[PDB]
């Protein structure tokens, strides 16, 4: 659940 260091909220 991480895309280019952006994690799910």
């Amino acid at each position: 659940v991480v895309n280019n260091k952006v994690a799910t909220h």
């Epitope: 895309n3 799910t8 909220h9």
Partner: antibody, heavy 123, light 108 residues
Amino acid sequence: AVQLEQSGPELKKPGETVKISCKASGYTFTNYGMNWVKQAPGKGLKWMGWINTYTGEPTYADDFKERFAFSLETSASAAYLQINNLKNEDTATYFCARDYYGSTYPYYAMDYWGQGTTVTVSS
Amino acid sequence: NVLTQSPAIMSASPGEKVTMTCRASSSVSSSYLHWYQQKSGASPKLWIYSTSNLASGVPARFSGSGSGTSYSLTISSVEAEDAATYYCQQYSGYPYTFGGGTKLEIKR
């Protein structure tokens, strides 16, 4: 149907505790952060912080690092705001507001808002 | 990152073009500068997101622009229903902050 349905108005005494719920529907609860916003009577919007609904991790804004607790019951798609040791200044309307997302990334805006919960602190 | 909105209160006759400003103390990415509309006590509504993007159902008479530390919301021809308070909001790292609001009153 995306809805954030909040609990009814509360009256509490100073020093008591209040817990407000925000029941989410129409979307995967755990994929969007839940934000909390305070609006004192006749004043502006103030962001209290947010809770990560996937991990349960709460983040508090600098003025709400004391007596404030965000929590979840993910099975119920519900988010909670607890305020401890209530003060008169906690008299306000509290909104829960969902994270706005693009196709992948957060916009760091709030798209869906609850109807708000008025808290009155008084003896 | 403090948002300052002006004017605090503004008045416009229907059909007039109006612009209200939001200035930040430090840079905000155009991606992360938003506007909400709120009518007396009811829940705020997301109005403009990422500077210039109108939320669903927002009329095309609204627009937003700006960059860095200077942003604005414009209404090309004001309507009665636009009577509201409009708040800008930013993220540039936490916390989110909101401006103090611009209250738009309609002249008749």
